[PDB]
Amino acid sequence: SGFRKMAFPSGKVEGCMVQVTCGTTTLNGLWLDDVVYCPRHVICTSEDMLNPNYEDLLIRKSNHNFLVQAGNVQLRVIGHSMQNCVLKLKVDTANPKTPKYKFVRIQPGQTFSVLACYNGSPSGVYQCAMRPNFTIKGSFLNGSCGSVGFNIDYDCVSFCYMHHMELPTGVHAGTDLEGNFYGPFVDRQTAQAAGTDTTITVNVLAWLYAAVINGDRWFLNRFTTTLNDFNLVAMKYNYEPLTQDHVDILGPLSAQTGIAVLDMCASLKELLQNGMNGRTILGSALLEDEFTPFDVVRQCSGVTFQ
Amino acid sequence: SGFRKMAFPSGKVEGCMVQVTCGTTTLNGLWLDDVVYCPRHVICTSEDMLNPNYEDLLIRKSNHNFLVQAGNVQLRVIGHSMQNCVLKLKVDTANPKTPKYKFVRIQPGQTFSVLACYNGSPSGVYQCAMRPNFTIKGSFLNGSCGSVGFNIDYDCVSFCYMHHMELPTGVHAGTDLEGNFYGPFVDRQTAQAAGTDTTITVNVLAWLYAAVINGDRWFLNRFTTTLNDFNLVAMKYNYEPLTQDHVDILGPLSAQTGIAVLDMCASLKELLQNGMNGRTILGSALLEDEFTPFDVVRQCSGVTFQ
Ligand SMILES: *[C@](O)(C(=O)N1CC(F)(F)C1)[C@H](C[C@@H]1CCCNC1=O)NC(=O)[C@@H]1[C@@H]2[C@H](CN1C(=O)[C@@H](NC(=O)C(F)(F)F)C(C)(C)C)C2(C)C
Numbered sequence: 001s002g003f004r005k006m007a008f009p010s011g012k013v014e015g016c017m018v019q020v021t022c023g024t025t026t027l028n029g030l031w032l033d034d035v036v037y038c039p040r041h042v043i044c045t046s047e048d049m050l051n052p053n054y055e056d057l058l059i060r061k062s063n064h065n066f067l068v069q070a071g072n073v074q075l076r077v078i079g080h081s082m083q084n085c086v087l088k089l090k091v092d093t094a095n096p097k098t099p100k101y102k103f104v105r106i107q108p109g110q111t112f113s114v115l116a117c118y119n120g121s122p123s124g125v126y127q128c129a130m131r132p133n134f135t136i137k138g139s140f141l142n143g144s145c146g147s148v149g150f151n152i153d154y155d156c157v158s159f160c161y162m163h164h165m166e167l168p169t170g171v172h173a174g175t176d177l178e179g180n181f182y183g184p185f186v187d188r189q190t191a192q193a194a195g196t197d198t199t200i201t202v203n204v205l206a207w208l209y210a211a212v213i214n215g216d217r218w219f220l221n222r223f224t225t226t227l228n229d230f231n232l233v234a235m236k237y238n239y240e241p242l243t244q245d246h247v248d249i250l251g252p253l254s255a256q257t258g259i260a261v262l263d264m265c266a267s268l269k270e271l272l273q274n275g276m277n278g279r280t281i282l283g284s285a286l287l288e289d290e291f292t293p294f295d296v297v298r299q300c301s302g303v304t305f306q
Numbered sequence: 307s308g309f310r311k312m313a314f315p316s317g318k319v320e321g322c323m324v325q326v327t328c329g330t331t332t333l334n335g336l337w338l339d340d341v342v343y344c345p346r347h348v349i350c351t352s353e354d355m356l357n358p359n360y361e362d363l364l365i366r367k368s369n370h371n372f373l374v375q376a377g378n379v380q381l382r383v384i385g386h387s388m389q390n391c392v393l394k395l396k397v398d399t400a401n402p403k404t405p406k407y408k409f410v411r412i413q414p415g416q417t418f419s420v421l422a423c424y425n426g427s428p429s430g431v432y433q434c435a436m437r438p439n440f441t442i443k444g445s446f447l448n449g450s451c452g453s454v455g456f457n458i459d460y461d462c463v464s465f466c467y468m469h470h471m472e473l474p475t476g477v478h479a480g481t482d483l484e485g486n487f488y489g490p491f492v493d494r495q496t497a498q499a500a501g502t503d504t505t506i507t508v509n510v511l512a513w514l515y516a517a518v519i520n521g522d523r524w525f526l527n528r529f530t531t532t533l534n535d536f537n538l539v540a541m542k543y544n545y546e547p548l549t550q551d552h553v554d555i556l557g558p559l560s561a562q563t564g565i566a567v568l569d570m571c572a573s574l575k576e577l578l579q580n581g582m583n584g585r586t587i588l589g590s591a592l593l594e595d596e597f598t599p600f601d602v603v604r605q606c607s608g609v610t611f612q
Pocket residue numbers: 024025026027041049140141142143144145164165166167168172186187188189190191192307
């Protein structure tokens with residue numbers, strides 16, 4: 001029993017983290033095979049970052065201008081290219097600790113683990129959700145750029161996030177590993193703000209199933225609803241629309257608990273309209289939307305990774 | 307910016323996890339050098355666990371009765387001994403991935419990372435606190451026994467917890483790595499309950515400093531208090547007494563923010579007496595007591611591990 005925000009074990013990713021320095025700018029890189037991936041603004045000074053011309057700064061750089069360290073080992077750069085907002089440095093050494101891996105662009109609502117790094121070294125690990133507004137609610141200090149987000153499937157690391165920047169309200173934006181931002185952000189220091197966020201409904205329902213599984217069942221009412229009535233009531237509270245796909249995704253939890261998805265929807269509608277009235281669910285006084293159905297299943301069914 | 311419950315990177319510990327089977331009971335073991343450490347009730351059947359005689363069951367076991375697997379590799383046991391509630395299996399292979407390490411018995415209030423495992427494989431990682439009542443609020447399914455808790459200091463893993471059991475209310479109990487339980491629990495299936503828990507005051511204050519650092523400052527009042535008046539008011543709310551040691555421990559955060567500890571104490575007193583009145587601090591609607599001063603410093607100063 002119990003239900004915690006749980007990250008994926010980080011060891012496979014730890015063995016991929018390097019320090020990248022260019023001029024006086026140092027951040028983190030991801031060393032896979034014989035390529036180091038890092039945010040392309042490693043090639044800027046502070047000054048430059050207000051409105052940088054990245055292809056101009058990069059044309060003026062030679063391989064030797066990039067210092068890549070993996071512990072007390074310098075890796076010689078033998079090539080470099082820019083892919084969108086990500087810089088690729090070819091090195092003369094393939095990373096022996098390269099795991100089985102993919103690059104995935106995740107969808108709003110999907111979670112991942114962030115391995116927060118400084119100077120190519122891990123600080124710690126925690127789970128995040130890609131928010132509907134294409135931000136994450138992270139913990140990142142200066143030096144954290146190049147820190148990555150990932151999922152593990154069994155033996156395979158799916159890299160989905162590389163950290164670039166922090167927006168007002170202390171939320172975070174970055175790219176997939178092909179250097180395309182999530183959301184409308186740009187890698188320059190100018191006024192940008194996150195869009196107004198929404199609550200990930202399917203995830204809140206998953207979390208309500210997690211509660212039931214753990215014996216926290218007070219919020220279950222005797223009623224059902226239609227997907228129609230549910231979506232109308234939830235729109236008022238800034239909840240995303242629940243789709244039939246979302247309903248189908250919730251099937252495993254629904255089947256495990258014997259609670260139809262539209263019954264849980266009725267229970268949630270009552271929580272939204274009536275609030276929690278001094279009560280907690282799974283320790284929490286607010287509804288949690290940063291557990292996916294799969295996360296709930298993994299945690300409550302003990303899925304592991306090799 | 308941002309403030310997340312962050313675990314230590316798990317890679318050093320992952321390389322130490324094995325599966326231990328004895329008869330039909332399988333759980334996790336910790337492989338350091340040429341010793342595998344696991345809960346001693348691996349040598350029980352279900353039946354046995356209601357009131358086991360561990361030294362009797364163990365005398366009837368031979369080395370070969372313990373199957374230790376590390377991936378698709380069986381490690382031959384060449385010795386076995388019991389230390390309190392922990393079984394030590396000497397194996398014929400020293401673990402090549404053994405990190406620099408210590409065994410520490412942590413104090414109530416101190417945090418650690420748990421690497422939750424099943425069948426010797428990692429499921430995920432999350433942070434916990436040793437509660438004043440010597441339980442942790444974990445996430446552990448059947449098969450999780452032998453999962454360990456740890457801290458990383460730079461390069462050195464301090465192992466402080468090995469998981470044994472789950473109590474009513476879905477909280478968890480276990481041992482240090484010398485097999486002594488935290489708290490009054492015993493490794494047998496009989497009625498045991500956690501003592502009534504208390505809130506870790508020093509940790510809540512640390513978390514209030516974290517909030518200030520992140521710009522969440524609404525709860526700061528203009529007042530100060532004495533350590534005396536604070537401790538009287540906090541006793542009513544089931545908060546632990548704050549000691550001068552705790553005050554001294556909070557010095558770094560106090561100095562960084564310019565807020566005296568007894569001013570923060572005044573702010574907290576007001577929160578306890580008046581509640582939060584619909585407001586959140588760092589995303590949270592309840593006061594959080596599972597971040598230590600050091601955790602706050604690490605996260606808000608970017609301490610890393612090699
Ligand atoms: C990242 O570049 C980094 O860690 N380092 C080390 C270094 F200084 F050498 C480069 C940082 C990470 C930031 C720093 C503030 C705390 N948390 C973080 O995530 N990224 C940046 O500093 C990026 C790069 C320039 C500006 N910027 C920002 O994050 C800024 N944001 C914005 O301008 C805004 F649009 F509002 F989002 C800043 C104001 C937070 C500094 C780039 C190229 C966008």
